[PDB]
């Protein structure tokens, strides 16, 4: 996938103006620099491989992460899927107004000790569980329930001191594509929030301990990093330029276009 | 020649003796449901007569000081005629819009508009924490108006009326990647788009979602001198293409 | 049992792998695709659609929408400036946040040559010409009309037509350019100058106004994808 | 869980009835038991509603004067009805609901 | 099953869903026609606009 | 495997009436929506795939789950094998008169510190053997027995940190497939307990840990995972109302329907 | 040993048993004229029953 | 000894995978199986079932 | 790739002289010692392998190591990639003008407790996290902050007890080879810094605990280590005599060309 | 699971060691070669160069 | 794919980058007359210089 | 990051105005906040710039006597002018930049 290379020119004067032109009819002009002055033939080797979707977007990103007690009542996290919280994966979304992609779900997941009153701890490898449930599934509410185990939800088992695990999920949506944007209510009658769509639901995450409160507090941390492949992208958006402000709505606080200078002919 | 155009539509006719080149979509023009996009299981109605026509919103004064005006295209359209009234009592529906904005001046006015037609424009509340209600954000063909200066936090539920960032916190220098044109009153005078059908969805309600808006901004403020006309309006036309229905029901 | 021997490298987890995995939702079948309109293939498909630079922020105009126009009036004396910029696309803060400078602040190296789309929005007896100066660095910035002319420049006559792309080429010595504020690998200058006045007949306003657009050329091309400087954070939504 | 304006401002007048409310939707992924506050800060408890039968006597100021609404308190209302409004009934009003694994508030100031 | 890279490489697919390959990373085609002149009469570059 | 299409109609009025039939002879009616109104020619590109039974039944559940002490006489747990204990799995396997499968079990064992009361624990790691029984072989009493080891029961040894062990079980039955339900008793006088099959015995699990008792106690946690695969069903049957009471026979207490509303014309 | 996913895939047996094999999850066939249709004298959609 | 490398996503244990196993009693045989009426062979051949719709709760 | 062998001579009277010349022409002679005396014909053996390129460059040289301490603010190394800082590499690299390769970044990275004042410390392994940023992007200042994980810069996550992290990178410059040497400024006015050069900057290394303070200060240690392959080099150069002082300039102490002897004939 | 037995020699780091390894950007596109004069292509093609021989030390 | 060594080896690539391969180490050519005789006239062993 | 002369002496005379420089350029790397110190050791600090504004009040016998000279500290200008030099002005300046990731200092010995 080269790129164009230019042909070389004459001095020419004639009736053919290729550089006046009118921006009225929304096109914007295709002309070559060989046309304003006299260019040589060069060869061209670049390349426009790594401005491509599929260079642009299939990076990994953290998207949350959330820590939980062991020793504690209800200590676990729950976790809705959606990528609006982070702002530096957000704004790369927002380019685009109709996605479609799957996805590949890694954890980074550590553990500290705290500030326990027992003499001489010491404990074995630890294992944490990452529950998945689809939107509608029963989920549990506290740690220690028979809703974890005695479950057909695809969760993953992993123990400390090996490779991060890492599952795939595919394009579960009901439209065709994901809707980054809603322009319009959820409710026939007009009422209520404004651009809360059904259309880009994927499910909660509940990770959780499963050994018990050997001698002391363990607290730990785990990041999730998403991974798009397989991405379409349609109808493309100016990028934002305002600070968000929430996950739901697109509300800001207004700001100027750019930074000033001194005066319009400062270099 | 190369500047006249006449687009006519079921009964009515749209002619121009100085305007520029007509822009359309992505590249693809209107065409009706193909059998393998389809998802309804029941036969579509096809009026093709008493939709496919040009009708006329209301028209706005072009002042000195103005900021710009925004419609949203399947809510202005929901009083004119059989357009109005088969949205009524079906269920789903899919069009493809033909955007006429028109506006004369002589050969002593300047300025400069820019038309622009924006699919999915979620706008901003005024509080940060509040969503704007239905009635300041659209009307009933009738232009909702931007301002110049940044709404007060005391109002509750109101649009986020600040004219550089176009509503939606982007800057307003980047709308051109959306299909536009000018209006340059040197040398045009008419401004024409067509617009395909552009959703997630095959078919999609019209009472609850709005997807598309178009808007208008003068980027080059109205100016004169003493002694010429001044009251300049602005005056938009839409006609609907190759429109579609599905699912009947009561009115609502 | 066949006999492996583990490379250094394993059990890592480097955020730009390429690498299969297992799914979690077995014969999951998609719903299929659809004819949307409007697909985008490539991100140098967005920096070919114009956008109006904004050339005259001096504090005052950057909360307007006075910051896209460039005051023209009819001038007393002949040979003044109207403008001035050098040529940084990712460094600049007058072509930072448009929709080049905007895909320029997620890669590093560029190249190619640069587009620059003008339009007279002023009156239709008023005319005028003007001189589009650019001039590769080295020296200074230009501060006659005596020394812009030197460089490359095309002369842009008002009429019919009101719009003229001066395309400035690609000058320099390395086969790409930095996006960030560098001394070794700057692009110059660009000002536009008077050549004649704006003359207008009776009862017609004076200051006309012109706008500026940018894009790039049909041989753009970007590298080395980082991330961008200009949304932080502090929190969680 | 989305409540549809989580902040605004009531005027009322003396021996009137406030009608506070609060109105929600259902996101699919919510499928847990049901859990409604509300609060005041003129941080207590004035009303509950959790495990389908309503606790009610908790502030002494308020006692038996407030009351929920509708009588389908799992279809998206939460609205209370505060009778006999005085002048000592100024703070912000939050109604808290939590259905796992959602939560949302709104901050209602009501000023006579 | 066997390509080309940016001299050749071995590429199998293992699992047997559609999810569960690895990214193309050599989608190379583009078409800027359609945000470039997105107009209905054609326009030469030579002749003037109108 | 896609789903049929749907066929375009005219306006008809004729003797021939496809909506009016008669259930009485036991017969679900077989009539397409394009014979009561006016249908379009959809193609249909749906599928039909995970509805079938090798992906409605071949994921993992957990069985059971018991704890031993290792500072402890008959420090161990023995199980017999049977689906009948967990609730969640149990109500899928009814849905089928019939079944058989072969099995992949698998076990994820986690371990905790009891609170002892030696100075300065420190215990390398823990080593774990899970010993299979086929019906009728000879059982281990206490945890300190030759028969443990001198046995040619076939099982598995596993120490901490790695990747959970797993082996398969093919169909081990007498019959030709599992009886979920077994109505009539087992003794020809028809005296004694009613729905006891001998045509479901897999066997029992022996878990016990292998190391000694160092300084301190560890009290471990293993759960079970099936994961029936090749399984071919017969004879379906109406899903499980009630609540589950015993693992052994099928009793319960009545509960009405479903619950109720206000009114029958009430939305 | 090698067949299409739901582009192909790569599938090898290794152990000498039957039981040790994976999941087959394409045995794709149904017949719905059992349950719906048990009857001895055939039934017509237009005609009527009796 | 082949040099392999060893990706992310091992040594886990997903609740829903396809992988294969070594059995524990090895060269067993089956018993054959039987041509037992009413085979089903996927789960909407139930759903082509009618069934009574209770349409008259009324809390009584 | 054999070496040139020898060919026999006889003993001649003649004319043609191949041992005397003119170093004048600056052509150094290419006689063989079949000239001067007289030789055997030797089939030769021997290899010039192990002299080429790639066999002289492509091994792992250590290039920076930076300590880091967990309970700290602002804890984290960042280092500016560039080879000048060692000098058993520097010394190989600048035997030639310009240089062209890739890399193999390799780290190998150790912990140490520190004195700590807690009561019965216990760490689970830790995690460490190596962040590469091309030079323009962000930095972060902090090492609790969220630029280090919501970002698309090519990082890697490491837990201990495993092989050593390894990425590659290509050669990433704006010219066609790096340059090892500037003879002139960077600014047009010939003002300011003599050798700096902007071709061939690579970008920084940020690298940080992902655990927290648990219970006891940890300092860990990183060691880089380059691999430079499908090396080309162009215009060699003479080794470097003086002992280097500075990471940017040349600038060096005078000394002499070797060490002495006591007189001209001493052997 | 194909059957592996790990030799000794792994999860080690040898400095001169031939193995793959996955890069960090992906498809990256270098800048095209040039026709330098002075290629050097062995070491033994600098041995083949003379050079004074400092044969008069004596300390001063 | 499969050459000889310093008898037989196989290499095979597996990413699909440049510079993901392996290293050379059998580039053997040399050509040191660009060092030795850079001269415009050629230079004969027997004849003298000058 | 990089100073133009990191070391060197100037000779003045008394109750002149001194003109220490300390320019710098910017390698592509340094994008953090900027910052700039002052030093002297006849190691106390005598003026600041962090966070865009000036601090100056740090030397009780060089109170409001130094001052930055240019108005565009962010092009490389971090020359300071010392009015009204006295005899016990004698000490090395230490022009400490640090804009991240990158170090630079200055050590200018004045003598008059």
Request: glycine residues 6%; neutral net charge; contains cysteine.
């Amino acid at each position: 996938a080269r790129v164009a290379d230019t042909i070389s020119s004459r001095p020419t004067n004639s009736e053919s103006i290729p550089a006046l032109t009118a921006a009225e009819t929304g096109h914007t002009s295709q002309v070559v620099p060989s046309d304003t002055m006299q260019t040589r033939h060069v060869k061209n080797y670049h390349s426009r491989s790594e401005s491509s979707i599929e260079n642009f977007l299939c990076r990994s990103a953290c998207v949350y992460y959330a820590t939980y007690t062991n020793n504690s009542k209800k200590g676990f996290a729950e976790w809705v899927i959606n990528t609006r919280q982070v702002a530096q994966l957000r704004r790369k979304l927002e380019l685009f107004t109709y996605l479609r992609f799957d996805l590949e779900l890694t954890f980074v997941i550590t553990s500290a000790q705290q500030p326990s009153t027992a003499s001489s701890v010491d404990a074995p490898v630890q294992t944490h569980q990452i529950m998945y449930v689809p939107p509608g599934g029963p989920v549990p509410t506290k740690v220690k329930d028979y809703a974890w185990q005695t479950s057909t939800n695809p969760s993953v088992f992993w123990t400390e001191g090996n490779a991060p695990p890492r599952m795939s999920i595919p394009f579960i949506s009901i439209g065709n594509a994901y809707s980054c944007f809603y322009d319009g209510w959820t409710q026939f009658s007009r009422n209520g929030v404004y651009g809360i769509n059904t259309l880009n639901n994927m499910g909660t995450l509940y990770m959780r301990h499963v050994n018990e409160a050997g001698q002391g507090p363990i607290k730990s941390t785990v990041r999730i990093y998403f991974k798009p492949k397989h991405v379409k992208a349609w109808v493309p958006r100016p990028p934002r330029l305002c600070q968000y402000e929430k996950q739901k709505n697109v509300n800001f606080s207004p700001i100027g276009v750019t930074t000033s200078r001194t005066d319009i002919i400062t270099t | 020649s190369d500047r006249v155009r006449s687009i006519t539509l079921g009964n009515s006719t749209i002619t121009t003796q100085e305007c520029a080149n007509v822009v359309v979509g992505y590249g693809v023009w209107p065409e009706y449901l193909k059998d393998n996009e389809a998802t309804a299981e029941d036969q579509p109605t096809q009026p093709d007569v008493a939709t496919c026509r040009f009708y006329t919103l209301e028209s706005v004064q072009w002042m000195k000081n103005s900021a710009g005006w925004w419609w949203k295209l399947p809510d202005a359209l929901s009083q004119m005629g059989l357009f109005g009234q088969n949205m009524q009592y079906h269920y789903l529906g899919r069009t493809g819009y033909t955007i006429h904005v028109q506006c004369n001046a002589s050969k002593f006015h300047q300025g400069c508009l820019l038309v622009v037609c924006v699919p999915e424009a979620e706008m901003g509340c005024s509080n940060l924490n509040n969503t704007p209600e239905f009635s300041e954000l659209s009307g009933g063909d009738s232009a909702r108006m931007f301002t110049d200066t940044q709404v007060g936090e005391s109002n509750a539920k109101k649009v986020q009326t600040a004219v550089w960032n176009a509503g939606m916190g982007v800057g307003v220098g980047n709308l051109t990647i959306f299909p536009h044109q000018w209006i340059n009153l040197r040398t045009n005078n008419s401004a024409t788009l067509v617009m395909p059908y552009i959703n997630s969805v095959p078919m999609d309600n019209m009472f609850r979602h709005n997807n598309l808006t178009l808007m208008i901004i003068p980027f080059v403020p109205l100016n004169y001198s003493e002694g010429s006309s001044p009251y300049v309006p602005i005056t938009v036309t839409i006609a609907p293409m190759c429109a579609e229905y599905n699912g009947l029901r009561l009115a609502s | 049992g066949l006999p492996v021997m583990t490379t250094p490298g394993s059990t890592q987890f480097l955020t730009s792998d390429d690498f299969q995995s297992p799914s979690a939702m077995p014969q999951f079948d998609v719903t299929p695709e659809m004819q949307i309109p409007g697909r985008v293939n490539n991100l140098m498909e967005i920096a070919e659609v114009d956008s109006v630079v904004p050339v005259n922020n001096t504090e005052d105009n950057v909360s307007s929408l006075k910051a896209y126009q460039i005051p023209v009036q009819s001038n007393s004396d002949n040979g003044k400036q109207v403008f001035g910029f050098p040529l940084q696309p990712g460094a600049n803060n007058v072509l930072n946040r448009t929709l080049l400078g905007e895909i320029l602040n997620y890669y590093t190296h560029w190249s190619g040559s640069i587009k620059l789309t003008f339009m007279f929005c002023g009156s239709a007896m008023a005319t005028g010409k003007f001189l589009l100066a650019y001039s590769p660095p080295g020296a200074g910035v230009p501060k006659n009309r005596k020394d812009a002319m030197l460089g490359t420049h095309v002369i842009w006559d008002v009429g019919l037509q009101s719009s003229c792309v001066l395309c400035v080429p690609w000058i320099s010595q390395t086969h790409y350019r930095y996006v960030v504020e560098d001394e070794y690998t700057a692009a110059g200058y660009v000002t536009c100058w008077y050549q004649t006045n704006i003359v207008v007949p009776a009862d017609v306003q004076s200051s006309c106004d012109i706008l500026c657009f940018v894009s790039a050329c049909n041989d753009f091309s970007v590298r080395m994808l980082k991330d961008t400087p200009f949304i932080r954070q502090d929190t969680f939504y | 869980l989305s409540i549809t304006t989580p902040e605004e401002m009531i005027e009322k007048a003396k021996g009137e009835t406030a009608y506070l409310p609060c109105k929600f939707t259902l996101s699919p992924e919510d499928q847990g038991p049901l859990d409604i506050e509300w609060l005041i800060s003129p941080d207590q408890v004035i009303i509950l509603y959790s495990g389908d039968k309503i606790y009610d006597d908790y502030y002494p100021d308020l006692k038996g004067r407030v009351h929920f609404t509708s009588n389908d308190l799992k279809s998206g209302d939460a609205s209370i009805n505060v009778t006999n409004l005085q002048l000592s009934d100024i703070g912000t009003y939050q109604c808290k609901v939590k259905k796992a694994p959602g939560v949302a508030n709104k901050k209602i100031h009501l000023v006579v | 099953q066997v390509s080309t890279q940016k001299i050749h490489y071995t590429n199998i697919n293992y699992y047997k869903d559609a999810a569960s390959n690895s990214a193309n990373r050599q989608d190379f085609t583009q078409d800027p026609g359609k945000f470039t002149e997105p107009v209905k009469d054609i326009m030469v570059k030579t002749m003037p606009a109108l």
